[PDB]
Amino acid sequence: DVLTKLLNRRFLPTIFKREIAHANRTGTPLSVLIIDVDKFKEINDTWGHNTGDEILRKVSQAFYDNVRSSDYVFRYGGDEFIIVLTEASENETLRTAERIRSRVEKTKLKAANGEDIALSLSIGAAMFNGHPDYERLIQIADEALYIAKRRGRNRVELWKA
């Protein structure tokens, strides 16, 4: 059960505080992806929870196949996940997000009527900038995610000022 591997959101503060101190002291990059499964509620309502659960498993596996054991994958909300990447530059963070976006888009998953359900992700990315408050990093990634949603979904946006 790949779903049992996902980290619970209660551990966000502890992991972030550790990784923030680590990044400040080592000068390594630290970044966040906040990821929404496009149309998840509509899909769950139309096709039911078996289909929804299967989608969550396929999406979760796409995350694990594209990150390292030193990265973290959390369940953030009903439709959403947070990935914390350690030692990924801005370019590598964007490449990782794109690999994940593309993998989900290409995933074939059949509904009860034999149609393939179109799956996609919206992703907001942000780089840690040295500030001690992890909530600020989440907020800027979430602003980028909102822009990804409003610009039509199935896309990655990087926060910039």
> Which residue numbers belong to the known binding site for Mg(2+)?
36, 79
**Pairwise CA distance, residues 34 & 103, whole Å:** 16
CA-CA distances (angstroms) from residue 145 to 62, 80, 121, 148? 19, 11, 10, 5
Cβ neighbours around 114 below 10 Å, total: 6
Coil vs helix vs strand at 15 = helix
Q: Cβ atoms within 10 A of the Cβ of 96, count?
A: 23
> Could you tell me the sign of the dihedral formed by the alpha carbons of 8, 14, 17, 18, in that order?
negative
Q: Which phi and psi angles does 73 have, rounded to 5°? A: -125, 115
Pairing state between β 7-8 and 72-75: parallel
**What's the distance, CA 158 to chain centroid?**
13
- Residues within the annotated binding site? 36, 44, 53, 79
User: Which positions make up the binding site for substrate?
Assistant: 44, 53
- 79 noted as active-site residue: yes
Selecting among 38, 65, 71, 79, the annotated active-site residue is: 79
Catalytic residues: 79
